[PDB]
Design a protein around this ligand. Structure first.
Ligand code: UHB
Length: 248
């Protein structure tokens, strides 16, 4: 029958909705997260379409020769201050289901910034977006629960600082960080830590910890940008990269 011939072809057309480079990535971030829970609880390739659909997030490969690739690769390495070599492997356009509509694009000062995260967090981040940390009020607010700015979402403009948070995964030793449009708004510059910040100071939309220099000493080794409402973040790219000074 011809009806049967058409359904088998639609299965082909379904499985092809997933580039090989994107299936391989979805495998790795899933592998990394399963390897991590196995470890704290006791311990080509066929298109793994099932795992990608659960992320409710669209991931496209930008080809390593595209015009888009060389431009984005330039912007990541643009403020690489510690010139310890980095090999930018792959770049993926990204789009969360609800992110493009909830985004507060109308604040102004929308700037593209870097958020690093260990590889096991990537499944969580792609399914739910970048989440605010949980405030602590059952006990004394230690230095282990907050960052240097308070309970917010942290970005930098420098690959040198995002490499401090983009820890290499156990699966392949590659590092991931996101590129996100961040609606900064009115941005208060800070020179001293504040761990009590649950929101931006009055009249401002975000806060910026200013990195120490020989002229101006502050409490910040790195430039830190923090926002306090999740819909000031729109993820735009995943960057797969690797540090040569990781081997041997
Ligand atoms: N949906 C989600 N699924 C999984 N992990 C998720 C998630 N939303 C947020 N996270 C993860 O939670 C973490 C988090 O909030 N916090 C709380 C605040 N943060 C402060 C801090 O030092 N971060 C920090 C500071 C400066 C730069 C950079 C970062 C992280 N990325 C950077 O380039 C420390 C960790 C964060 O590392 C993020 O990767």
């Amino acid at each position: 029958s011809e009806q049967l011939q058409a359904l088998l072809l639609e299965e082909v057309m379904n499985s092809s909705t997933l580039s090989q480079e994107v299936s391989d990535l979805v495998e790795m971030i899933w592998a990394e997260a399963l390897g991590h829970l196995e470890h704290m609880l006791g311990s080509p390739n066929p298109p793994s379409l099932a795992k990608y659909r659960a992320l409710r997030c669209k991931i496209e490969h930008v080809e390593q020769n595209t015009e888009e690739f060389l431009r984005v690769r330039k912007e990541v390495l643009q403020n690489h201050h510690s010139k310890s070599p980095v090999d930018v492997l792959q770049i993926f356009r990204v789009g969360r289901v609800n992110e493009t509509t909830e985004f507060l694009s109308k604040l102004g000062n929308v700037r593209p910034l870097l958020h690093g995260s260990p590889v096991q967090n990537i499944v969580g981040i792609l399914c739910r977006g970048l989440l605010l940390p949980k405030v602590v009020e059952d006990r004394g607010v230690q230095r282990t629960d907050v960052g240097n700015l308070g309970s917010g979402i942290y970005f930098s403009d420098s690959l040198s600082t995002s490499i401090k948070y983009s820890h290499p995964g156990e699966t392949d030793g590659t590092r991931l960080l996101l590129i996100c449009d961040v609606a900064l708004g009115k941005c208060m510059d800070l020179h001293e830590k504040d761990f009590s910040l649950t929101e931006a100071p009055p009249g401002y939309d975000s806060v910026h910890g200013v990195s120490q220099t020989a002229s101006v000493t502050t409490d910040f080794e790195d430039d830190e940008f923090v926002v306090y409402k999740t819909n000031q973040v729109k993820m735009k790219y995943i960057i797969k990269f690797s540090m040569p000074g990781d081997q041997i």
